[model samples]
Each structure stands twice: as C-alpha cells, then as structure tokens.
Target: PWPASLAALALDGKLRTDSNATAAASTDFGNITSALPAAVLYPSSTADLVALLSAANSTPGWPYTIAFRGRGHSLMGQAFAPGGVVVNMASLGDAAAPPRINVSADGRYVDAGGEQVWIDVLRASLARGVAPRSWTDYLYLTVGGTLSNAGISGQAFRHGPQISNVLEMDVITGHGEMVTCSKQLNADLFDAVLGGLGQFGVITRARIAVEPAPARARWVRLVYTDFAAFSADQERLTAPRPASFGPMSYVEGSVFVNQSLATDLANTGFFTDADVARIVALAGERNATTVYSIEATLNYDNATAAAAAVDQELASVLGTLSYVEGFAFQRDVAYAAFLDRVHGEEVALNKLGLWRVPHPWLNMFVPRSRIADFDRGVFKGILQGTDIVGPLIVYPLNKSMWDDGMSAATPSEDVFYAVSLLFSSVAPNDLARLQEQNRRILRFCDLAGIQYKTYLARHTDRSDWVRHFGAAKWNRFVEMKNKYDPKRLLSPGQDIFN
Candidate 1:
C-alpha cells in the first residue's frame, strides 16, 4: 500500500485497489513482466494529474513513484509502478468524444489530445481534408504513447518520426507544475519530453502538424533475391532528391519467406487456387525460402484514371530498381484501407488464437555501414532454420528527419537500418527460445563492436541505460530530471533515475 499521505491525494480522479482495475494495467502486450501497483488511478482531468504528481513530489525524500500508462502497449515493464500508482492516461474522459481539431487559419496543423489514438486523429483530420503526414504502421497506438518514444514508420524516411511533427504540448511536470512548451517557448522541456521515454513529465495535449490528405495509395511490392541489391534500392529511394518530383511518397522494405507468404495469402483470401499453384511452383523453381522485398506507395486522386496515371509513373520508378522482373505485386487502395491493412491481419490472427501470445520482439537501428555484416550474422546465420511467425522488417531511415534536441538516440551515421524481429510464441518454452535468440543477437553485436540503439528499450541495469544515452545526453537528462522532478518520483519503471 502507498503511504497514507499520497493515497489521500487522489482528488477528482477515481483511485481503487480493486484487482479488476489494476490487473490489466499490471501487464502489457509483451506478457514478459508483471508488477501490480498499489492502486490504479483514472484521472478525470489534467487537474487530477497535477494533484497526483504533487502528492508524490511533496513527499519527503521521495518514497513514492508515478507511472503513466497509455494503452499498456509497452513491451517491458515500462508502464508498471510495482507498489506505486499507475495512472491510466487513456481514461482522461476525452477518449470518449471525437478529437477536437482546430486547423490553423493557414491550414497547417491539428491539435490532438494525448489520449487520442492515431486512427481517431486520422478520421477526424481526414474529415476536414487534412491529416498528419507521418505515422506508425499501426494506428492503434495513442499519441502520447508513440511520442514518448520515437514514433517511427515508413513515412519517417520522408517526413520524420511523429516527434518531429509536434509543435507544442501541455505537460504536467514531476513537481505538479502545469506548463506549455514548444520550440520557441520553454524549449528545454519541449525537447526533453519528445522521445524522452516518459521520464520528465506527462504529455496531456499536443499540437501536431498536418497536410492535405491523399485520397488513394498505389501500393507496390517488388521481390529481390540479392540483399545488396535490395539495400542499394532502398537507400537510393530514401535519399533526398532534387526539387524535381518523383513517384515515391512512402518507402518500406521487408524480408519474407515462402511459407509465411503462402499462409498469409491463404488466410487473407488473397489467393486463388491458380494463384497458389503459381506461387508454389515459383518457390519450387527458385529453391528459395527467403525473399527480400520492397513496398512503396504513391498517392493519387480518387479517380480511376488518376490511379492508372500514377501506376504508369510508378512503372518508370520501378524500372530503376534491380528487383527481379515478373516478381511484383501492385494494387491501388483507398488511403484509409491502406493504413488499416494491419488491423485486418490482426483480427485474423486473434481469431486464430495467435494475437494474445507473448511477443519477444526486438527493434534496433544499425548503421548502414555495418548492415551487410549484420545481415550475414543475424538474418542469414542465426535465423536460418527458425519458423518466424511474423515479418522481419528491415528498412532504411533518414537521420535528418529526426530532431537532434530530443532524447531519442541514434547511431552517428546519417543513414541506418531499422531492423526488427517480430516474434510471437504461445508456449512458455517457445517464448524462452525466442528470447534466448534475442540475447544471442545482442551478444554477437557486442563481441563484434556493432554500435546500435534499441527502440522500445528494455534494460535492467542503469549502467546499460547510461551507455545507451551516452555521457553527454545522460548528464543532460539527469539535469532536466533534477530541474523538473528533483524527487525522482516519476516513472520508476524506466529505471533511469533512483
């Protein structure tokens, strides 16, 4: 139980010790760790957040901590508070209503609540004929959740991560001080909160930049047998070009094996008997299990002719890539359908009893310089015989798109590969095997001196975190922690501060 002093401070918000309320908040999508809180809090307003933070902040010598949970999607125990309080940021009451969007008089942006999901933001903004330019592949993540970390997706190669698009935020600091910060105002706090991993404060609202919505997307996928050729094409596409326009709007790549594709097409009703026969024959002919593929999207007007025109334009761009001819898939889809593609597969997986399994996923940023070495070691070597349950996403991201002032760390290189192993396992032993493989991958990187940064970082030791942040950034983070939250009473789950 929390100290009587802190427990009594739950003003205007509902606080309870009911196991039902605390159970869901205790675990996350990772299913890897669980630490039940003394109580779960549902803040009705930002005022309640201030009260909660103040109660912890005013305590002598910092005996309590506060963790803000948004959708509880964090892979590790980053949202857990053990015996402390876990505040459900998503239950702030704004989630029930449509997001209030105020477009700039000049039509430049939309202000969104931190509790709102990206899908809601998209629906609201698209209704107004404008939308946020960057996104995570999945839209179920809350605005606060992704921004707390660095929100990355295929669009990041062009427009940058979600953190790069924020203009301002209403934040409640560790001291219970409510403040507004932006690039030109309270800039230190502004930068610190972006990609700060919920260390400094809680984001209550955000002013997000928006753009004219695209009506449709021409989704194209091409196959390549050579890793070097795949990497070269991806790098070339993501590189900044002249003011002269090109067909590319978004660029992403993946590694697929024949078995998974066969299963996916069959599951999604995406293949006919003839199509399956052709795919099987092709797989047999190539004697290949793994295939490197790139997926690109070109936006176009809703008219059918516009799609045809865009396809012709995409054809020209496709001519430049070294992917094997005749081994490509292309289709035109509504903008909303294009973004909702993952959710469809998610529903199918859940129906098949796969969605609730343990996710031993690992995401990393490896410098382009060492990507070939990594491919040789991890993809081609360690994962050779495994039955990967999900996509092995490896794509290129432009460094210039990210803000240098934020706490998000990246390799010094301008271009890095975002390599992710998305694994799912039902049995405990299977989960352990995948986790051990993850450990082996990290150990290999260490022995070979491959400097990389992990996304959704999970580490038990402060020294590893210090090394992750490096000396300068870590020192700066501590300075801000002391300035905004001297008591170290926030997000104990991050394990960065005492």
Candidate 2:
C-alpha cells in the first residue's frame, strides 16, 4: 500500500521500501527511540514534495503520516513515523537540484535550503567573509531540524535562536499547498512553523540574516565555586555592551570537573601524568563537590596585536568579576575555529569510540529566580553523585531576543537559565539508570514547583505535552494542527495528536 500509493505521485525521487533501508532510518543520533517507516523518500524537486504531500493527504482509511528526517539528530525519534513514510530531506537537494545560497547586495540576509546544515551555510558564507548571526552549537543538524525546535546556543543571548533569525520560508502545507510565508505573508503559518516541530508544514527553504564574519576570537574561561558569582558574571556578560566596553562577542556557562578536563587533555596528549596529578591536587584544594564556570569570547581581526590588545582589555574586565582568583584561563582561535570547536571534540571522541555512545541528555529552561533552588535540590543533592558522567551545562539567555509568536516556550520571566545534563555511556545498564535519574529529576522539579520548559522536549504522552504547553498554548498548537493538518498526517512520531 505504501510504495503503491507513493508511486502514484510524479516524484523525482526514490521510494525505498526495504528492511535495510527502513532499519537504517529507524533510529537517530539520540538512539533513545526507534520507529521504522514503511518507506523512505529522497525528493529531488519541489514538485516531487508537492506530489508526495498530495498523495499523503489523499491516502485512504488511516491517513499515512509523512515525517521529514534530516541528519536524524532528534533525541526522541521525532523524525520517524511508525508505519508511515519518512522523507529524507538531506538527499532532497543534491548537485542537480541544489539548495541555493542567495546573499543580498547589502549582505543582510541569505536564502538557504531547509535541508542544509549550519556548517554548510557557515563555509559558504565564510568564503565570502560573511556568516549567519545565530547558530546551534552543533552544525551537523539540518536547518529544518533545528528550526522545528528552537535552535539555540551561546549566541542566543544576543541574536536569539535560529528561528528568530529567519526572514521567510517556502513551505508545503499539510494539504500539499506550496506557499511562501514571512512575517507579513501568511503570517499565521510563518509564526506557527518556527519551533512548531514540523507540525504545520514542511519548510523547503528559508531566508536567514547574516553579517561579516569576525577574524579572530579570544576565548576566556573563569571558574566559580559559588552559584551567585557565576550567575552574576553571566548576567553582566549577557547585559547589553556599548562600543567602549562589554563582556565579549559570545558568552556561555557550564559545570567544570577537574578529572573530566584532565581526561580530555590526556586523550589529546596535551597533559603529562604529573600535570594531571597537579590539576587534580589543585581541584581538591578547593574542596568543593562541584564547581561552576563561565566562558566568554571577544572578537577581533586576524592581526595578532589587535587580538592580544582586545584580550588584555577583556582580561582587565574579567578581573573585575568575582570568580575564583586562581581559576582563569584564556586561548585565542580563529573565529571560525571557535565556532567549530565542538566538531573537533566530536572527532576526538569518535577516535576513542565514545562518539556513538548513548547520551541520555536532558535540557531544560528554568526561571532565573528558581535556578538556585533547583540547583541546590538537584545538583547538590541528587546529581552531586560522582557516578555522574559527562558535561552538565548551565547558562543564561535573554528573552528579548526571542519572539513570543514562535512556538518555542521559555520561562515567563525575561531572564532564565538553560540547564542541561549530558550523560554518555556505552553500557545499556548505565544508560537505563541515567534515564531513571532523569525522570526523578523531572519529578523533583515538579514537586518543588520549579517553573521550567524543556528544550528539544520529549514526552511519551499527550497529557504531559498539554501540561508542558499549558492549556492556552496547547490550544493554539492544536488549533494550528487542525487548521494545517486536518488528518494529523505529519510528525506522528511526536505522539501528540495520536
């Protein structure tokens, strides 16, 4: 029934129906969930997508769901459909039917394919000495993938998420209507699609803002024992900066562990046994269970003197902060290198066979007012266990940078912290335990009445989603679903309408 119905379409793409193909598309980078699709689509043209959408919309009996998968980066199998069709957006636009990059004469914006990854955009823009203003930390993810959810990273405090940077998008509605939408055109559909989790339509292309790429970045790291100091520095850095002075071009905060850093250095052959021992000793001297830290960056041209001069000035500014005195470090890297830092880390982990390990990552946005309380209860109590493995991140973001009309939810307050726990393990038993711990953490947050929102949220049931979005937002979401996808024939893997 799948390939038969799919074959009815005038598609310039392959309709693959096989165990191997389905199984290959079964899981994603997260590996937390798996649902094999009945067929995989590699559309090469907008007409193919339109035809396929029409076919899906007209399917008999139980309307077959058609979910789009790009890079399969979703943590909860949001890209797969249980017994329906999964469209592979990555293969949609190749050399023959390529994603166009149109940089404006003013260099204000660029139009890119929905399937394109940020890295591709970065490289293409960098060739012209330009770059997108907002980006996710990991660029391997597809543009549609991140835009479906809110694409956030350190730069979110300034330029907002990737959703905010979008000017317009070409979308195929659930009804197979090909439409171009912006803030002023089909405004309802435009607002609904961003952070809409691919519920409203399939984005084919998007116009994104861009700026000249900086030449160099002065990366600085400072440690903190007290949450107060960390939060203070984070807020100060995130606050608006004038031309005379400010925190830096980018800001971020995260949990710091001595053993972890030393292990990373050891892997890289950057540390001797005695050096790591000394680091462990220094970390022990602090006698703290866990420490917090802030990382800031200043931008400059490739000129070494100018970069160092900016570094020195920023160092002076950093000196005024209340972070631990002996805990500051600095490094200088090309702007592109700084942005692509995680790619190198991934390469190292891959060589060590740690890259594909299970990652039970949980990310949440908590109100700034309740962060200390949440940290005290979770970080200092439950999560303080030494058995905890991998990075624990916490950072502040400004709500002003975000648009309320978009589907992504944040704390009601203007200021909030993006707290995340990334637990990686090769053992199934360890991952199972970590998953349970994540549940407990969520339960505790609920019991403690901590106002929060999950980033890249995953829920097993509709009730939880209703609670997550609240009745008001939930209604709007459902209304959009009904309006755009009357038969709920999209993103069935999300388990919302089902």
Which candidate number has the best TM-score? 1
lDDT of predicted model 2: 0.80
**TM-score per candidate, in order?**
0.93, 0.93
Off by over 4 Å in 1: 1-13, 94-101, 243-246, 258-261, 264-286, 303-305
Top-lDDT structure, candidate number? 1
Local accuracy by lDDT, each model: 0.81, 0.80
**In order, what is each prediction's RMSD in angstroms?**
2.6, 2.7
Weakest ten-residue segment in model 2 by summed lDDT: 262-271
Cα lDDT over the full model 1: 0.81
How many clashes does each candidate structure show, in the order listed?
Answer: 0, 0
